[PDB]
């Protein structure tokens, strides 16, 4: 349940389904206690049933939708697993490595099989942590936080 821009909030479609269930179930209890004409009890137990289907797996009996604006299927629990909207495709499409990089490539004639030439600039970012400590090792910086600020701006690197 997050804050976006100004007054715009954004939540997982799951939450709507949950309320669907919660309310019905509550209405149920009230409905049994307050007295109970058969028709209405069942009619609800029905709804209640459908509701339970909803968060578990929508579309298997009908398609529940968020109020007018998006006739979108509220991502049922399984939709999130299997990835009914190409989520599986994206999933095995890859996660995100923390120490990575990307740039154009250019032939390195004198380079040796053994090696490859990479922009020091990129190296800095990539091997930042390892660099920070080496800085402390040397007189370059007093400490980590120091070494970091020291590198926070291009023009400030000895």
């Amino acid at each position: 349940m997050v804050q976006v821009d100004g007054g715009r909030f954004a939540t997982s479609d799951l939450n709507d389904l949950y309320r669907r269930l919660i309310n019905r179930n509550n209405r149920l209890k009230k409905l049994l206690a307050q007295g109970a004409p058969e028709i209405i009890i069942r009619n609800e137990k029905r709804m209640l049933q459908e509701a339970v289907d909803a968060l578990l797996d929508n579309g298997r009996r009908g398609a529940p939708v968020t109020n007018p604006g998006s006739d979108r299927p509220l991502r049922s629990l399984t939709d999130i697993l299997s990835g009914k909207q190409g989520r599986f495709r994206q999933n095995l499409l890859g996660k995100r490595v923390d120490y990575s990089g990307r740039s154009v490539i250019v032939v390195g004639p004198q380079l040796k099989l053994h090696q490859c030439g990479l922009p020091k600039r990129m190296a800095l970012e990539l091997f930042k942590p390892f660099l920070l400590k080496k800085m402390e090792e040397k007189g370059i910086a007093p400490n980590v936080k120091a070494a970091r600020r020291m590198l926070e701006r291009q023009r400030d690197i000895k």
Binding site: I39, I40, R42, N43, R46, M47, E50, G62
Partner: peptide, 12 residues
């Protein structure tokens, strides 16, 4: 079988 109708029929 698609709710609505059944209960409508039900108490009607």
């Amino acid at each position: 079988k698609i709710s609505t109708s059944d209960p409508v029929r039900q108490y009607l």
